[PDB]
Amino acid sequence: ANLWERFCNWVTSTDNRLYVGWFGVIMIPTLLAATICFVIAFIAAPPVDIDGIREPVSGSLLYGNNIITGAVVPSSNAIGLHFYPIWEAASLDEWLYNGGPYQLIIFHFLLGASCYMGRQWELSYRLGMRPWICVAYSAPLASAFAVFLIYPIGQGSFSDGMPLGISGTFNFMIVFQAEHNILMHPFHQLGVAGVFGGALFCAMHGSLVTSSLIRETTETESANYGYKFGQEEETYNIVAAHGYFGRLIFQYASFNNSRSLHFFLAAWPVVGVWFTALGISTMAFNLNGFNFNHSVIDAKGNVINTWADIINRANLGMEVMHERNAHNFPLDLA
Amino acid sequence: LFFQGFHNWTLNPFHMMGVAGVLGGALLCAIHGATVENTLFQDGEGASTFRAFNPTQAEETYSMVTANRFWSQIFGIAFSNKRWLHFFMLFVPVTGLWMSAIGVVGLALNLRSYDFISQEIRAAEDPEFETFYTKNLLLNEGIRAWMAPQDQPHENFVFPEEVLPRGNAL
Amino acid sequence: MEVNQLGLIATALFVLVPSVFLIILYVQTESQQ
């Protein structure tokens, strides 16, 4: 009946249409701050001197961008990893030129997104659930930390964190390849396996359940009306799905236990994406992909090119062109 | 890498739909697996919950109801229909792959989304105008000149040093 | 920017025609029950 205890009851109430919770108490303001700044910046921010060379990149719609080319541009290389809140700028005009808004958005988002993950634990506890859905979301979350925080920390500049835009994303991944040979890095290869495999097993599982729906409907109605929300009986025949899939391969490569099957569905893309987030996070400290350049030579010592040498020629063309005005000395050491 | 330098394939909306189809597939795979494993009914006494499924039981092994309240409260919307859910799991990655296939058919003919005409006209006229779109084409240009001679040896490309595009110092 | 003039009509119709189709079918669904 006391004031604080009634507040606590509302914060943690399972009856709000959207659950708040104590993680919600940080999530909501920070994601509103990041969302609102993002939307305004994407539409109307002026150009930002991402690379610290007084060469501003236009990122917003009103400065001549479309949905595909626009971005919130990363803050200036002149700032590096210095904190640049609004109140550290002489004026908003300066804060805008130097790329303040990127910092505001990524710090608020990474906070709110960390609280998002915690909110997933919390409501799981209030509802009597098992608790590890949040562990599955840690994979995407770790990935966002890598490209917005970890890689900047290791390279020493938020100017090298991933832009908040579609083509900025591509710019980031092209430059990454030239500087880290990420394609030839085993952790990125596990990401691809986690992501290709994830889409594969998604299609598989959906096609198998869908193949074994039990007839509950007529040809003039959606099969989906054969399941009623909250019915106790399962709505497909798992033995029939096992019987088809085990004959498509052989019996013992097929799951008859739905618990193992769904746990498999969870672990494969989660673990693959952990590794690829770990890839970005360790290439942040320049432990790069396998280098087999000139690894094959002949009896005399002529270099015999392989496909790795061809990859190198493409990486070289990325290297020498990117940030074409920013390097004064021969090696691009960060 | 070829497809980036020569076709600017990342700019292609059919590729982008494939990306969303594969990535959304992988998300669906993970979120559906985790949900089932974390709305399980207690059907056995042990801490390993796998043992308490029976492939021939009639009963659902996890609570669609609790799953739906959870995701409605966390994300605003949830699935309510197990049939739709598993069809959507088929639908998403299959469609995404079909879309990417179509875009590669276009590139068979060098029918790319290489450029935005409006950007190029403005940038040709206004040397202070720079976007991530123009930055990425410099990189494509690097890629082509630096890989072409070794990657297409039948063309006998000889690019003397002085014609190679290069930024400062590198 | 020097942009394809027809882009606008194309986008509007691209949105409008399929959306109106969906609304028509939804509203007459609700008038049944």
Binding site: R17, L18, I43, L61, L62, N66, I67, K228, F229, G230, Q231 | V65, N68, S72, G76, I77, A78, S80 | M1, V3, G7, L8, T11, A12, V15
Partner: peptide, 30 residues
Amino acid sequence: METITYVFIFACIIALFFFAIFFREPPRIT
């Protein structure tokens, strides 16, 4: 005009979100 078009569509999606959440078909049991 292209700016207005982009923001308009984006604005429609946000509005749709609102209705999809708060004016959904309410799931009913059995």
